[PDB]
Amino acid sequence: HTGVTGPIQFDSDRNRVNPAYEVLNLEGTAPRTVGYWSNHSGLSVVHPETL
Amino acid sequence: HTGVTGPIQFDSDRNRVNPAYEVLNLEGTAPRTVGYWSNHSGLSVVHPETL
Ligand SMILES: *[C@@H]1O[C@H](CO)[C@@H](O[C@@H]2O[C@H](CO)[C@@H](O)[C@H](O)[C@H]2NC(C)=O)[C@H](O)[C@H]1NC(C)=O
Ligand SMILES: *[C@@H]1O[C@H](CO)[C@@H](O[C@@H]2O[C@H](CO)[C@@H](O)[C@H](O)[C@H]2NC(C)=O)[C@H](O)[C@H]1NC(C)=O
Structure with missing residues (x-):
């Protein structure tokens, strides 16, 4: 599923x-x-979605 | 007068x-x-009312 809090997936x-x-x-x-x-x-200044 | 924008006075x-x-x-x-x-x-980090 893709909810309001982004993608959700359980490994x-x-x-x-x-x-x-x-x-x-x-x-x-x-x-x-x-x-x-x-x-x-880990400790980026950009949004973590761009990485 | 003392308005919504603080004190007002004209020299x-x-x-x-x-x-x-x-x-x-x-x-x-x-x-x-x-x-x-x-x-x-001039160029304080505190609010200018404290000075
Ligand atoms: C969190 O990041 C870690 C580190 O990048 C990842 O877990 C490892 O992922 C690699 C490749 O998928 C596996 O070979 C390792 O065995 C994993 N290690 C562990 C301890 O799980 C993964 O990308 C992320 N894990 C979660 C649960 O989000
Ligand atoms: C803005 O600050 C200046 C400088 O501190 C002041 O103007 C001087 O004030 C002193 C004392 O009141 C006078 O002796 C000078 O003649 C003033 N100089 C000038 C150019 O006005 C004052 O505190 C403030 N002035 C205004 C208009 O806000």
Whole structure:
């Protein structure tokens, strides 16, 4: 399936297929991102879908 | 008077009394501030009312 949270697929270890986290720094009056962690690359500044 | 845009007062040169500008950097998906210019100090990182 392809849901509202992107593609969903379960491999042989029952995780989701491609997890990724958006590193937020809280310094202003709003949560700004400062990059993105992915399973594939890890600590990118681009969106993790381009990799 | 004290309006919605703070205090308002006109000196002998017909300006407003204390002008100040919020330097915006446009790098994310939103305009973040990176400091504040004031007449009083000029290029502070604190709000210009504290000075
Ligand atoms: C998370 O990333 C890891 C590392 O790239 C991947 O898991 C490995 O994938 C390779 C190729 O598919 C396999 O040969 C390894 O045996 C895998 N290792 C482990 C520990 O699973 C995979 O791309 C991602 N895994 C998940 C569950 O998202
Ligand atoms: C903007 O800041 C300037 C500089 O601090 C000030 O203007 C001077 O103020 C002093 C003291 O009040 C006077 O002696 C000078 O004659 C002023 N100079 C000029 C060119 O006006 C003042 O604090 C602020 N002026 C305005 C219009 O906001």
